[PDB]
Chains A and B, each alone.
Chain A
Amino acid sequence: RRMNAFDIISGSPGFNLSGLFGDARKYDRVERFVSAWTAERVVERLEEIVSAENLTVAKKETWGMKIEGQKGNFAMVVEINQLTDELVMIEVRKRQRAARDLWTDTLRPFFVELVH
């Protein structure tokens, strides 16, 4: 399977009405990263980061992973789908209770470095 144009459109962070409900949203708006990495390699590297940075794997499934840290302060759901023969779409939904930090300095830069 390869995702189609309407997966891109319908899942875009601004193409829904969730903003109407403000703080009721559990996760921040989805952050998407398009990469030529394989899903298996993305998961492998995430597991290395989990081991190095004192995180927890809440879920590891065919669709991706849920990673937690900091005694309930941080969580992210990472979904990986094939976009083209060459590229995956990585969708990251995260929440952070507290206002450098894990997400800014380590996790988000990892996703950015995947991009290609």
Chain B
Amino acid sequence: DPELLARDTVFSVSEIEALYELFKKISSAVIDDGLINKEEFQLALFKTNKKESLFADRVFDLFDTKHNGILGFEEFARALSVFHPNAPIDDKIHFSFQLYDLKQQGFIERQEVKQMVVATLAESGMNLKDTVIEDIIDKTFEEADTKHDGKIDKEEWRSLVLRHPSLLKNMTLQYLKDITTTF
């Protein structure tokens, strides 16, 4: 019954049905168990299981709210609702904060930011020198760290992404608007 998920998300019933078609494809790609495992999630995101990514690691964790290391359709649909263009921005800010808190013990810390800058520059083959990365991170903290403790807390994260909305572009999938035609 798609009415329950439709009620709880910003998807319509028809969009939930379309999302289920996508779910069935992803979930049957490696093990035919009606569920999405991490390998299947990587194949969906990247088209290969050879790309090991801290983004995939974090996002899969946050999708997997019943933390058994495998996704059912309810988890898939509720998580993807966060990415819909019409989802509450507070949901996008919360999810992204928890994503970037790599060690999962609070705050977005300098070491977590640096690990992500190094990894993302490597995705582009633009492996900038340590002094340049440090300059960029310095400037980031200069702006973000208004409660001056050298760490980015949830209120500081909110302020930064409210100020620079393009920082949340990866928290919206415009494709979800046309899901019923694609699927």
> Could you list which residues of chain A lie within 8 angstroms of chain B, going by C-beta atoms?
2, 4-21, 24-25, 30-34, 83-84, 87, 115
Contact = CB atoms under 8 A, between A and B. Distances in A.
- Most chain B beta carbons < 10 A, residue from A12, A17, A33: A17
B136 interface: yes
Given A13-B123, A31-B124, A83-B136, A8 B117 contact: yes
Contacts of B47: 19
B9 interface: no
Contacts, number: 105
Interface of B: 22, 26, 44-47, 51, 53, 55, 59, 80, 83, 96, 100, 113, 116-117, 119-121, 123-124, 126, 128, 132, 135-137, 139-140, 143-144, 160-161, 164, 166-170, 173, 175, 178, 182
A111 to B, nearest CB: 11
Given A4-B143, A19-B44, A24-B182, A84 B170 contact: no
B23 to A, nearest CB: 10
